[PDB]
Structure formats: structure tokens, C-alpha cells
From a paper:
During viral replication of EV68, the viral genome is translated into a single, large polyprotein comprised of structural and non-structural proteins. The viral polyprotein needs to be cleaved into individual proteins for viral replication to proceed. The [name] cleaves eight sites in the polyprotein with a preference for a glutamine–glycine (QG) motif at the P1/P1′ positions. The conserved essential function in viral replication makes the [name] a promising target for DAA development.
The C-alpha distances between the two structures were calculated and the average for each residue mapped onto the two structures (ranging from 0 Å to 1.5 Å). The largest variation was observed around the active site, at the P1 binding pocket. In the apo structure, the areas surrounding the P1 glutamine binding pocket form a narrow and more open channel. With the apo and peptide-bound co-crystal structures with a viral cleavage site of the EV68-3C, we were also able to characterize the large conformational changes that occur upon substrate binding.
Author numbering: 1 to 183
Amino acid sequence: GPGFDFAQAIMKKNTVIARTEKGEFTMLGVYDRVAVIPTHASVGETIYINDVETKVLDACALRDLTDTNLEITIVKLDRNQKFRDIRHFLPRYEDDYNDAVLSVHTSKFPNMYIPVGQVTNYGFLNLGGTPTHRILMYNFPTRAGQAGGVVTTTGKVIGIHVGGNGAQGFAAMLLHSYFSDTQ
């Protein structure tokens, strides 16, 4: 179906397996050598990208106007391969959505596709003790190891998975404005 075709294409061309000291994460490549990863991955000065030691040229843990964690870290990678530019698939504002898919790919969870259904946005989530803003919630019982998983709808890349409470899953919202690249 159309949703799954889109999630599969995003997985096909715009993800890598990232590995920090904290373990494996699904990593979404956004454009050029810029990718995102949940902030609790604790990205260092180097990171394994599909098992290749890759220097980190920059790592920026995003925080909003309120100096509040957004749980996305934007990473610039020292590698020759260039990500296809999917910034046009990113929402421009916070929204709700229907029929979302959570797509994960790691060694532990290879090629995982979960139709999580309706997604609702919130301004708030206390994430393992850290206040966090701009969160998408889906009523599905996600599990540790899916962090960084990409959430999509037909034609939109809307968030990356950051955590869960046993019954619900939470994603950090992706906004086009994050990747404005205006110094």
C-alpha cells in the first residue's frame, strides 16, 4: 500500500545503522551529510555508520526557545556518501496525523515496520526525567531498541521514535525549520 511504499523508500535511501556507546540506533539521513539521532544516544566525536567508524564533524542537541530538550541531535558526518535531500518531506508545523508507520532497522530489529495508526501532537513529555517538548504520541506498545525509528505518513517524514511507557510510543517531531542551515 502507498504508506508502506513510502516508508520502505525512506528506509531504503535515507537511513543508516548508527552506533554510539549506548548501542545501535536507526538514523535518518536528511540531506548532504546531515542526519538525526535521539539525543539520549549520547553521540561522541566518532560514531559507527553501518559498522564504519565515521568522524562526527558537528553534533547539536536541539533545544527550543525555553532551553528545553527536544531529544533530536543533528549530526554532520565525515563520509563521502551523500544523503538524498528529504527536507521537502518534513512538516513545517506541528500537526496530528492518521495511519502512521514506525520503521526501524537495527541488528536486533531488522526491517521492522509497525502501522502505529493515529498520531497526536503534544507540547510536553517528561522523558526519563528530562522535560521534553514537541512530542508525537501513538497508542502502540513500543520497546527499547526502536529509538531513532522513523515515523512517516504517505509523503511526510514526521518524527523519530524516542521512547515509550509500555502502552504508548513517543516520537520527537521533525520540522523543516530545523534544517534551515542559516548559520
